[PDB]
């Protein structure tokens, strides 16, 4: 449960995202790594999975973010498709939608996608020989 490949199916999409620069990855997202994190595994994956479906949701028909050219809306839908595809995952994992997120601080979606990546990658790191 845990170790499955769902972890996989995270870091696969985050590469996917983190390569990705559009006109809105600077825009911001609540930073749940603000935080003095006391939190299970469980919690910070549904608070991670709230912040990113608050994203999309708001953004997915924003002008700022749609794009002007053929290749700027491609690569804003192929952003917002990515980011529910790692939602579904993330709430997979999560087993919850009650995880209130507290913190003040905003990072750029840009960086708070780094930094999920580098706690999956350490989870997965920690599932394997």
Not at 15 to 35: G, H, P, R, Y
Not at 97 to 121: D, G, W, Y
């Amino acid at each position: 449960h845990k170790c499955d490949i769902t972890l996989q199916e995270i870091i696969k999409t985050l590469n996917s995202l983190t390569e990705q620069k559009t006109l809105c990855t600077e825009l911001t997202v609540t930073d749940i790594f603000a935080a003095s994190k006391n939190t299970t595994e469980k919690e910070t994956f549904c608070r991670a999975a709230t912040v990113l479906r608050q994203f999309y949701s708001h953004h997915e028909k924003d002008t700022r973010c749609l794009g002007a050219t053929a290749q700027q809306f491609h690569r804003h839908k192929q952003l917002i498709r990515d980011l529910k595809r790692l939602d579904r995952n993330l709430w997979g994992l999560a087993g919850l939608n009650s995880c209130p997120v507290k913190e003040a601080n905003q990072s750029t979606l840009e960086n708070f996608l780094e930094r999920l990546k580098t706690i999956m990658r350490e989870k997965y790191s920690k599932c394997s020989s």
